[PDB]
């Protein structure tokens, strides 16, 4: 065939050790660009004026950070949502001061990860598989979009995007609590149910299957040798597992259908994490957690504090201290 | 269905940003100020107040070294200072009379701010689109009293939720449509499992 | 897709027990340390640098400022038996807020 | 940065001692009769 035809055949080959594909044609270069820029910035970038007040924050290892404190720091509040590619800067030195690497990394990463999701659909189709693994990955992907793109858009600045760093992440969490009372938001509560329940059902499933593995090995060998890649026979007794779990709770609380069981395993965390993502993405537009501050009042009108008011006091501590030189007027409105 | 799901998802996202930023087809008289608008209105409010008290707002250096009221944008335009520096792209009818070819004009600021501009800027500052899910208006630490969540927040948040789940339905249905068209949406044929006819990866 | 995959179903399911069970056990140990205030609160090298260099700032120093706000603002109501009275003038606050 | 001077050796041995334990066990497994 012609060059193009052979190229297409190669790009879409089910035979490549790593699947390429058309999504991969975009994913590969964008992920490589984000990864390389990230690694170099995390090691060597100079301090970045995240809040646009000429107060540069040091993110990199060579400038006095460790793995836990280091970050690629968000772009300057002076930039806002303006697009700041390298060629918009007068010099690499200016680009670095203003947090150019952050934009480069996150835009390439978001594009690349969205293509990772497409690529998962793509390969499933090449392999004659059902197509929805890519829908499960939409949950973490939605969450990355929420913290690196939707939230900054709502608030008018990439300087309020999540920093690319471990301590930076906690900074974002704490400020987010002061500003949105996220803990009191039901979508974040559903996210907690999603991740705690995902952990729970992960352990539950692991333990129930492990508990009913069919004896195929001796006491000297790992039982894992009792399963051979590609064998036709199921390797555990689901009727035994259901027999156990139906008795632990009650019969109709347990699955005896593996397909229903595995659907539940997919659905519970994916749905909870979609609500986590939508929590961040709607607090992006300042629809915030429940506010019961001073909700309980006695017969005279004295305020009777509840645990909500004690939350409020912790939130106030975060609010009054955060970005301590950046506010000149009494309300923090974004 | 799937092509339409993708298109409605896209349109949903667009509407979200429209109601959040645009004050022409979503007049602030009816929908409340935009987030950028209310933040700028706050700086305007205190510039007005403090200049009434005698401050020279052009020369007032804030704690950071940047002007407390007025500073430059990264391309030189005179803009409000403090955190609202991010919102200098904002434009609205109550503010434009103060803007000259170089951005905010100090002489117009010192001499031409009308009472209707002060009122609008105080109204918009105090109707910023921030509030709780139970409709307590204000920052998250605010006490109960003011029953307010901006129509802008309700409309942006709802449409983002819808647009997102519509993206999910697009992927759900576009991938199902592909699989059903090729004949494997119900599972893999045990005697015609494609991967068993392929060479090993290694 | 990812470069690696399970090939052993038994290993897969044991790993699903292993990961969350081990993570919860690790969190429990950190909490036993917090029972004694034996915290990972600080990096001493960060503090020595920041004490001597008022231009040195990291996300780690930013978060301790948040902690200091949380302690001062929440303690009087959260710890009523202490009878804390913190006059306005002593409360840590940044500019304006 | 004024780091703990024992950080380096603690980190080095933390990696090396169990990594070498594993390598010893892997290699002698491979050398067992095919």
């Amino acid at each position: 065939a012609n060059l193009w035809e052979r190229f297409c055949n190669w790009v879409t080959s089910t035979d490549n050790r790593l699947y390429v594909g058309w999504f991969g044609v975009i994913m590969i270069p964008t992920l490589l660009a984000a990864t390389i820029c990230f690694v170099i910035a995390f090691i060597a970038a100079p301090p970045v004026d995240i809040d646009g007040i000429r107060e540069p924050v040091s993110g990199s290892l060579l400038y006095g950070n460790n793995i836990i404190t280091g970050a690629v720091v968000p772009s300057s509040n002076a930039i806002g949502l303006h697009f700041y590619p390298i060629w918009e800067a007068a010099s690499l030195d200016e680009w670095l001061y203003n947090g150019g690497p952050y934009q480069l990394i996150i835009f390439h990463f978001l594009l690349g990860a969205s293509c990772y999701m497409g690529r998962q659909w793509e390969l499933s189709y090449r392999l004659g598989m059902r197509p929805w693994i890519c829908v499960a990955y939409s949950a973490p992907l939605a969450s990355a979009f929420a913290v690196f793109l939707i939230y900054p858009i709502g608030q008018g600045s990439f300087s309020d995007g999540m920093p690319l760093g471990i301590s930076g992440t906690f900074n974002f969490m704490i400020v987010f609590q002061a500003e949105h009372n996220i803990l009191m938001h039901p979508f974040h509560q559903l996210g907690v149910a999603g991740v705690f329940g995902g952990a729970l059902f992960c352990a539950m499933h692991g333990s129930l299957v492990t508990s009913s593995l069919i004896r195929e090995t001796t006491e000297t060998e790992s039982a894992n040798y009792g399963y051979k890649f590609g064998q036709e026979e199921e390797t555990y007794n689901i009727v035994a597992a259901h027999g156990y779990f139906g008795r632990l709770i009650f019969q109709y609380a347990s699955f005896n259908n593996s397909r229903s069981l595995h659907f539940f395993l997919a659905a519970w965390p994916v749905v909870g994490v979609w609500f986590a993502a939508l929590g961040i993405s709607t607090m992006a537009f300042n629809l915030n957690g429940f506010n019961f501050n001073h909700s309980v009042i006695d017969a005279k009108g004295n305020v009777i504090n509840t645990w909500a008011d004690i939350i409020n006091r912790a939130n106030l501590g975060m609010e009054v201290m955060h970005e301590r030189n950046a506010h000149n007027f009494p309300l923090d409105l974004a | 269905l799937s092509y339409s799901l993708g298109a409605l998802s896209m349109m949903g996202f667009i509407a979200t940003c429209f109601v959040w930023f645009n004050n022409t087809v979503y007049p602030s008289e009816f929908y409340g100020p935009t987030g950028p608008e209310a933040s700028q209105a706050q700086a305007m409010t205190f510039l007005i107040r403090d200049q009434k008290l005698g401050a020279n707002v052009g020369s007032a250096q804030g704690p950071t070294g940047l002007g407390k009221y007025l500073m430059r944008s990264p391309t030189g335009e005179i803009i409000f200072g403090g955190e609202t520096m991010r919102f200098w792209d904002f434009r609205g009818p109550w503010l434009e009379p103060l803007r000259g070819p170089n951005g905010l004009d100090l002489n117009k600021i010192k001499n031409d701010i009308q009472p209707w501009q002060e009122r609008r800027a105080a109204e918009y500052m105090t109707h910023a689109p921030l509030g709780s899910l139970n409709s307590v208006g204000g920052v998250a630490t605010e006490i109960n009293s003011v029953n307010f969540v901006s129509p802008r927040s309700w409309l942006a948040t709802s449409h983002f939720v819808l647009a997102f789940f519509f993206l999910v339905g697009h992927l759900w249905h576009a991938g199902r449509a592909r699989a059903a068209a090729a004949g494997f949406e119900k599972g893999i044929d045990r005697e015609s499992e494609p991967v068993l006819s392929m060479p090993s990866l290694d | 897709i990812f470069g690696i995959a399970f090939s052993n179903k038994r290993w897969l399911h044991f790993f699903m027990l292993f990961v969350p069970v081990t993570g919860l056990w690790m969190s429990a140990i950190g909490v036993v340390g917090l029972a004694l205030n034996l915290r990972s609160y600080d990096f001493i090298s960060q503090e020595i640098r920041a004490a001597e260099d008022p231009e040195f700032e990291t996300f780690y120093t930013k978060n301790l400022l948040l902690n200091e706000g949380i302690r001062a603002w929440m303690a009087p109501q959260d710890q009523p038996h202490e009878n804390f009275v913190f006059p306005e003038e002593v409360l840590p606050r940044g500019n304006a807020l | 940065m004024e780091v703990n001077q024992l950080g380096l050796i603690a980190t080095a041995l933390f990696v090396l001692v169990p990594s070498v334990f594993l390598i010893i066990l892997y290699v002698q497994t491979e050398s067992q009769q095919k």
Partner: peptide, 30 residues
């Protein structure tokens, strides 16, 4: 010395990724 240590561990992990993918124990059917 600390920067060197952190980057050294990181580099070992990326190398490990490479061997774990391209020099894995190949999966063999049955």
């Amino acid at each position: 010395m600390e920067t060197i240590t952190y980057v050294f561990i990181f580099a070992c992990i990326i190398a490990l990724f490479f061997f774990a993918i391209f020099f894995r124990e190949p999966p063999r059917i049955t």
